Ligand binder design. Structure first.
Ligand SMILES: [Mg+2]
Ligand SMILES: [Mg+2]
Ligand SMILES: [Mg+2]
Ligand SMILES: [Mg+2]
Ligand SMILES: [Mg+2]
Ligand SMILES: [Mg+2]
Ligand SMILES: [Mg+2]
Ligand SMILES: [Mg+2]
Ligand SMILES: [Mg+2]
Ligand SMILES: [Mg+2]
Ligand SMILES: [Mg+2]
Ligand SMILES: [Mg+2]
Ligand SMILES: [Mg+2]
Ligand SMILES: [Mg+2]
Lengths: 88, 55, 100, 51, 129
RNA sequence: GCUUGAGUCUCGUAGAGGGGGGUAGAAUUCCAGGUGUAGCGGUGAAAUGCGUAGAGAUCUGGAGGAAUACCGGUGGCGAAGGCGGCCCCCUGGACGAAGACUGACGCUCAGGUGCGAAAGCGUGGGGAGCAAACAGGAUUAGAUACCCUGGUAGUCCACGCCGUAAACGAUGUCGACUUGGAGGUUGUGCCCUUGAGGCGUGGCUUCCGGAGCUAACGCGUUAAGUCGACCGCCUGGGGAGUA
């Protein structure tokens, strides 16, 4: 559900050291990554209504986590959505 | 159980007819009765065991 | 890289092609740097029921580690090929050896 | 289902039929489809078979 | 969801009591303590105890008189959904005087007997008789 | 600021959870043929129906659609609907064992959005069995039925509609607290593994039963007990879930 290899690489890319796994910035990027992947899954199929529930969930989460960060460090926030590429 | 190729261990989990045997007979655990079925089914598909005494 | 059990059954008459097939499927798999953890040319075995008419048939067990891609083309060539009367690529969960 | 029963005995000896087929799966499939009502039917094969 | 701790106290008590249970624990807080005090001071329980530093832990010793428990009724009165504030002249007196009402005033968490004397008012936390 | 609420990370485990593609055997109907001969079929009894253009019965070879016996189970999975042959691909959740990160980021939620059995509608397709409608045969005082012989939509696939069910546990969601017993299920720690085990410690579930609660029936650590947060809803029957 998103390779150890890749998942690790992003923790490596968004938090302090690896191990800083649960950093706000990092979860958002970890989710982002899966979400974007998933698009191709639901492209084909589209009827996979159950799996879709998990994906929406995915987004409910990120959205919530992204709002929290904003309230904290709107710098870490702005940096983040530029970096991932969302909000338009 | 461990494997479908084990037509040996397998053949004492079916009747003359070929029908899988309930767990209430074999005393088999739960988890394994499934492993057992899923491997008898495999055996059946690879003509390694009849579905039917009709053959 | 995923493992699979994999076993097919070749039509008796076309028995003599079984070698060339194994040779081939192997060069195919190894070709993409995939290991070949077990191989067993069970030969002509007798069938539980008759299938496609005709009884007995040439078996081939063969465990492998290879990308979900060569596994694909394998499954189809088993269709493209009329000599193989059944196949079945299976589970995974790490390699295996000897059994039977 | 099958009985060889070789030499000495003209008694049928096929009590094997009362071990599967017959009114087994054959009274079952004989008629009304069912569909979800067997659920209820078998929920008495256990509301009983508890004791 | 753990949005009212004081109710959880009032109830960990209430229950543990009706379960003729000698002890009772829970995560602590200044507010829990100040109440445990009044409960001891006014003598509805033997004595309390907070054991820990990182994650503090209230511990209360339940009194039992005859067969019965000493706390005949412990009930929240203010709460998150709906908060209560009586002045001084309007403070409540439980069981006509018997038993008591915990109330937090600007000068600490006292009883109604107290606050009346103190001459001031507050948020009537709960009732206890 | 804190770390216990809540998240993230590693490794696994069980599963009819979802979407897609392949594929198997048994049966039915049908087409062709071998043998065979006057009945088959159906009922309560009958008749319509089928058979001397050879039926039914039996054997063989095909075609096609639909569902997957046994396993199978107060078994499992999903938010509800609901999900059972086997295999691969894609994918959602749940759980457990270690510790490591985040540091209250939570709960609930009018409006909103999505999902949503069967029937039903639109277009093409598909159609073996079943079967509203309709047809015939019976029963009966009547028989627009219940039974019988047929049988169309439909039931099947794709795409899109509809948005309802006793859609029920007739019991909203989340959290904390409160005696027990016998199971089923599924993780995981330990033990001469020396037993097919011995003691623990999680998630899930079935049956009893204690306080308590209840009008009573009953519920009862999976509460209908003791408490809190938020939401939905009720206010005599009929009229009406109608105008
Ligand atoms: Mg507070
Ligand atoms: Mg057939
Ligand atoms: Mg035939
Ligand atoms: Mg998964
Ligand atoms: Mg919808
Ligand atoms: Mg429909
Ligand atoms: Mg239609
Ligand atoms: Mg009819
Ligand atoms: Mg309704
Ligand atoms: Mg129900
Ligand atoms: Mg119990
Ligand atoms: Mg009970
Ligand atoms: Mg409650
Ligand atoms: Mg209306």
């Amino acid at each position: 559900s998103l390779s150890t290899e890749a998942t690790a690489k992003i923790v490596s890319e968004f938090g302090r050291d690896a191990n800083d796994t649960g950093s706000t910035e990092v979860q958002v990027a970890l989710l982002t990554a899966q979400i974007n992947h998933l698009q191709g899954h639901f492209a084909e199929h589209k009827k996979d209504h159950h799996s879709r529930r998990g994906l929406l969930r995915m987004v409910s989460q990120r959205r919530k986590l992204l709002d929290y960060l904003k309230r904290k460090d709107v710098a870490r926030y702005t940096q983040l959505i530029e970096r991932l590429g969302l909000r338009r | 159980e461990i494997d479908y190729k084990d037509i040996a261990t397998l053949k004492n989990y079916i009747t003359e007819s070929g029908k899988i045997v309930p767990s209430r007979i074999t005393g088999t655990r739960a988890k394994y009765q499934r492993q057992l079925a899923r491997a008898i089914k495999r055996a059946r598909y690879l003509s390694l065991l009849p579905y039917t005494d009709r053959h | 890289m995923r493992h699979y059990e994999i076993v097919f059954m070749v039509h008796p008459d076309q028995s003599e092609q079984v070698p060339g097939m194994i040779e081939r499927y192997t060069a195919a798999i190894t070709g993409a740097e995939g290991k070949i953890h077990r191989l067993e040319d069970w030969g002509r075995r007798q069938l539980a029921y008759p299938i496609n008419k005709l009884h007995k048939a040439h078996y081939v067990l063969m465990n492998v580690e290879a990308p979900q891609e060569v596994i694909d083309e394998l499954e189809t060539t088993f269709r493209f090929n009329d000599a193989v009367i059944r196949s079945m690529v299976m589970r995974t969960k790490h390699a295996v050896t000897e059994a039977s | 289902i099958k009985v060889r029963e070789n030499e000495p005995f003209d008694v049928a000896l096929r009590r094997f039929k009362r071990s599967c087929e017959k009114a087994g799966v054959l009274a079952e499939v004989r008629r009304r489809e069912f569909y979800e009502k067997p659920t209820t039917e078998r929920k008495r094969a256990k509301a009983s078979a508890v004791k | 969801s753990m949005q009212d701790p004081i109710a959880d106290m009032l109830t960990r008590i209430r229950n543990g009591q009706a379960a003729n249970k000698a002890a009772v624990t829970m995560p602590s807080s200044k507010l829990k303590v100040a109440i445990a005090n009044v409960l001891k001071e006014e003598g509805f329980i033997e004595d309390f105890k907070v054991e820990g530093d990182t994650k503090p832990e209230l511990e209360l010793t339940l009194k039992y008189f005859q067969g019965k428990a000493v706390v005949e009724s412990i009930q929240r009165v203010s709460r998150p959904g709906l908060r209560i504030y009586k002045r001084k002249d309007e403070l409540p007196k439980v069981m006509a005087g018997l038993g008591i009402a915990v109330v937090s005033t600007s000068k600490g968490v006292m009883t109604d007997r107290a606050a009346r004397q103190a001459g001031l008012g507050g948020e009537i936390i709960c009732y206890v008789a």
